Amino acid sequence: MDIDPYKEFGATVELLSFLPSDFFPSVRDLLDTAAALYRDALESPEHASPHHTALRQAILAWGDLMTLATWVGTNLEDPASRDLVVSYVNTNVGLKFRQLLWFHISALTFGRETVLEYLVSFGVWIRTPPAYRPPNAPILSTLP
Amino acid sequence: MDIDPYKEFGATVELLSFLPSDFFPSVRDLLDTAAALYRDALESPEHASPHHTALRQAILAWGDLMTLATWVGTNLEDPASRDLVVSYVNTNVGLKFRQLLWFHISALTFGRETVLEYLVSFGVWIRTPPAYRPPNAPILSTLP
Amino acid sequence: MDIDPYKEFGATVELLSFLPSDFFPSVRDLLDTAAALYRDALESPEHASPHHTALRQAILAWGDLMTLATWVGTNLEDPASRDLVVSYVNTNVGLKFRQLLWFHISALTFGRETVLEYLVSFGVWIRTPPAYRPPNAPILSTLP
Amino acid sequence: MDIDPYKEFGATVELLSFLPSDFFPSVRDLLDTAAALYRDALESPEHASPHHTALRQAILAWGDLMTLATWVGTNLEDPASRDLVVSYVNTNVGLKFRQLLWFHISALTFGRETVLEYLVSFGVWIRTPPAYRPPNAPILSTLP
Amino acid sequence: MDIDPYKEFGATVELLSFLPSDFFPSVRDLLDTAAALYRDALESPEHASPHHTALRQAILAWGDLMTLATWVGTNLEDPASRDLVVSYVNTNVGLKFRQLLWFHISALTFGRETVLEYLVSFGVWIRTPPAYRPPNAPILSTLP
Amino acid sequence: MDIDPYKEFGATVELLSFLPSDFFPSVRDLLDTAAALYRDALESPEHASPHHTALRQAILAWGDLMTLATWVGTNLEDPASRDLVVSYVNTNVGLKFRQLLWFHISALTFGRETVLEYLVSFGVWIRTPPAYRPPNAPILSTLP
Ligand SMILES: COC(=O)c1c(CN2CCN(C(=O)CCCNC(=O)c3ccc(C(=O)[O-])c(-c4c5ccc(=[N+](C)C)cc-5oc5cc(N(C)C)ccc45)c3)CC2)nc(-c2ccccn2)nc1-c1ccc(F)cc1Cl
Ligand SMILES: COC(=O)c1c(CN2CCN(C(=O)CCCNC(=O)c3ccc(C(=O)[O-])c(-c4c5ccc(=[N+](C)C)cc-5oc5cc(N(C)C)ccc45)c3)CC2)nc(-c2ccccn2)nc1-c1ccc(F)cc1Cl
């Protein structure tokens, strides 16, 4: 009854379990990137590619929790209520789809195959013990 | 980037603003009806429609929000501090994509064309004042 | 100078007066119809039909009457005289204006043929004795 | 909703603002131009061009603003406030309106080509330094 | 690297040194005239001419300098310390490309050929002493 | 009424918002590079490519502020006047188009596509948290 968010794009939630938590950027940094690079294509009413379809949805989803953050910021009285709730959204639910923002943005910019190869390559990096890991962790980059 | 998802689908948020709040079925019925008859290619690796890709991102979001309601209802202290939040999810944020689930499901069984005419042909039914309104709203259905 | 705003379109004020006054939708409830359905076609720099060129003028004409209901609506010294006039805009100009928007916005969605026939149809249905008539009122609809 | 009343006609408010304000003729002095030249073409039940359909609306739009300047023009209790508003019609609506009539009534007599070129021409001629320019101002004319 | 921009355009800075300081129109009129009739492809992603690319870099520079005048006039303390700077911008640095805007705009409507002849045919008009000078400078214009 | 300085070259001011302030070299270092590599082509009166057209303009623009720096350095008396002004030009207005100098120089040397790919690649570098950023930030380099 539960769908894999990435089963349609080749990747999977288990595969994204490689990437540690702190690896992912903040939601602001990702939203600014899409709104900087793709803002002229996201708002365009065309199916340029499935990531746009997913990316338009993921943005509005976080746009919705911002509402619940603001509603809770004012219509609640207890500090442990008004804070621990909003602390939950940024902490856990925010992390719940910084993957989606990080994934689909990185997929559009770099192609799906380059992202999937990136995950496996990053998987090998993290597996190796600290003594032999090359300190420069692998990082995405285009290729002509 | 401030844009509704209903752009490449030929719609708006104003277009689906005519529909009264009691128009849309419950969230449970929509989720069930999704898996009742779309569970075939909905939870598969296949890609088939652009509606499916947008759909899958909606069902995961509600599963996210329900994780929020379960969290707040069990850990936040005061019901006067949390039942506001719990009822807020089921009431307002739920109705956010309480209709989003409705659009894609209705579009899939019927088509982006037939759903739009039902929306166009509904507002004309609802914009009409009560005294001169037919006693039976138009029925969404496929035309052979 | 008796410039009928409908003589170009195979109609006339007498037919639109032939229907009952209260049948017509409200101004606010009707602007969003084109604003939600035709916001892209109207704002386009190339007209698609004379209804576009005509409806594109009615929207601007209503602009100042709201502005005049806003400038005068908030920049007077006597509130005892503000609603004396500001009420007149929604009183006896909208009645001559809500008819105008309804014609074109219905003319676009259903063609000038069906609207002109509907005016004859509905205007009769309200005249026939109630003992002898189909109680299901006649209405436009995109479906046959 | 930024419905330029000129974007359909290869112009825009900035060009018509590019000319000086006082260049435009008066409303009364301009209505008779179409009323004397185009009283037959406008009142015809078949439009001859989109300028007809557009100019046919501006005349009626000015109708109520005179009526509103007549209803309010004579049906108030405070003359101290009558000219406070009635002056505004000829104050800051005609300025946005005398431009509108001038464009179409000139567009019909001389085609949309010559008017759009004249706006560029005259708007420049008033900008060039007086020491270096033909003092004979540029003007439309039916003769070559 | 010490070179004027008027090289690939077939000109110099000496050639445009004949023109008196009062020759060129104001900076406001040039900026308006740029957007009055070139705003079509001036603020677009298109590349069309080599004049447009040089132009766009001029309009941004003046917007830069005006940001300087606004800054100094509001933050620098003494008018005897700042009005020198403010008037210096509008007077001297303004006239630097007060003519630069004039050359490209005049070149676009007319062509690199026709503008040069007007410059060649102007100096002969201005180098001539006053007693034998025709009372009307040559007029820039296109030749069919 | 405002043009994007980079809208014609594919990039945009938002895209260049990735690069932090201190990343950009000084104006002297860039001018020496162009005057070292391109001084034999900039002064050539030919449109070798649009960056030359932009690059000739950007140089003279900074060449103009050097004049205002020198004029202010001598014809002003107050130290907070003569210093804070010139401090403004080097600090803010200098930074305002060290981008243009850095961009167009890097575009000529490395091709437009390589620069645009560089920005996106640098964008991904800066987004990543410090713990996982490869310490060697990405840097331009040719490719046969
Ligand atoms: C996937 O869709 C859904 O699940 C769904 C649907 C749509 N479907 C399909 C339609 N539907 C039906 O129940 C239809 C069966 C009944 N059939 C009929 O009555 C029927 C059957 C045959 C004929 C027929 O051939 O003559 C006619 C018929 C005509 C047919 C053609 C025609 N011409 C143009 C020539 C003229 C006709 O003139 C008529 C005139 C009549 N007079 C005299 C009054 C009477 C009948 C007719 C009607 C409901 C379900 N709607 C809604 C919804 C929501 C809010 C508000 C309203 N609706 N929500 C959902 C949803 C819910 C939960 C969930 F979790 C997920 C979803 Cl998505
Ligand atoms: C885009 O350009 C501009 O905006 C612009 C222009 C140029 N334009 C176009 C020309 N212009 C006019 O006003 C022309 C209309 C008047 N037409 C006429 O007088 C006219 C029209 C028809 C004929 C005609 O067919 O016979 C003739 C004519 C002749 C024609 C052909 C001919 N042969 C070779 C066979 C012999 C002719 O012998 C004559 C002899 C005469 N006698 C007896 C004295 C009298 C007339 C004629 C003249 C001004 C605008 N200049 C200037 C400028 C600046 C500084 C100093 C001077 N000028 N600044 C700008 C600028 C300003 C602000 C801004 F923000 C941006 C810009 Cl860029």
Residue numbers in the entry:
A (entry chain A), B (entry chain B), C (entry chain C), D (entry chain C), E (entry chain B), F (entry chain A): 1 to 144
Recite the paper's sentences.
The HBV Cp is a 183-residue, homodimeric protein. Cp assembles into icosahedral 90-dimer T = 3 capsids and 120-dimer T = 4 capsids. Putative Cp allosteric effectors (e.g. heteraryldihydropyrmidines or HAPs) have been discovered that have antiviral effect. These small molecules ostensibly act by inducing an assembly-active state and by stabilizing Cp-Cp interactions by filling a pocket at the interdimer interface between dimers of the quasi-sixfold.
To examine HAP-bound capsids, we reconstructed T = 4 and T = 3 Cp150-HAP-TAMRA capsids to 4.0 Å and 3.7 Å resolution, respectively, from a single dataset. The resolution was sufficient to position and rebuild molecular models of protein and HAP-TAMRA. These structures are, to our knowledge, the first instance of using cryo-EM to visualize a drug bound to a virus capsid and to show that T = 3 capsids bind CpAMs. Besides the difference in diameter and the differing number of component Cp dimers, the local difference in T = 4 and T = 3 architecture is that quasi-sixfold vertices have twofold and threefold symmetry, respectively. A T = 4 quasi-sixfold has two repeats (B, C, D, B’, C’, and D’) subunits and in T = 3 there are three repeats (B, C, B’, C’, B’', and C’'). In T = 4 capsids, quasi-sixfold hexamers have four HAP-TAMRA molecules, while the T = 3 quasi-sixfold hexamers accommodate three HAP-TAMRA molecules. In the T = 3 particles, HAPs are in B pockets capped by C subunits. The pocket of the T = 3 C subunit is occluded by the neighboring B subunit, resembling the interaction of the T = 4 D subunit with its neighboring B subunit. Despite the quaternary differences between T = 3 and T = 4 capsids, the local environment of the HAP-TAMRA in the HAP pocket was remarkably similar. Long range differences in quaternary structure were apparent when overlaying entire hexamers, for example overlaying T = 3 and T = 4 quasi-sixfold hexamers based on one set of AB dimers. The next subunit around the quasi-sixfold, the D subunit (T = 4) or C subunit (T = 3), show pronounced differences while the dimer on the far side of quasi-sixfold is completely misaligned.
